[PDB]
Design a protein around this ligand. Sequence first.
Ligand SMILES: [La+3]
Length: 120
Amino acid sequence: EQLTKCEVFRELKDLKGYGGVSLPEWVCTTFHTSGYDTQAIVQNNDSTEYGLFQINNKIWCKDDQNPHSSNICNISCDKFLDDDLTDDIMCVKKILDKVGINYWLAHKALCSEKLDQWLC
Ligand SMILES: [La+3]
């Protein structure tokens, strides 16, 4: 499920300001993270990351690969592969509360400058 820049901008409104992250930062960060693909999956050895925000199955969500996940967002990872970003955003806030925006490696490098390019 491929979102446009403006759909992402609108669908992430409830993350505006959280941990000091601006909406243009969130649009920029999800672009570099998932290419606005809500069905995005990436694996690194025994780790899998799910959805627009690429939330991992070691700490944040449970799945069949890692049923012993810390599951801190108390959710099945497959809930991050649907079109509705409500529970994705609830989990992102818990990640921000516990680890911060640096969870998203793309953020510090690619999403500090010309943030005005990420407005709808
Ligand atoms: La969802």
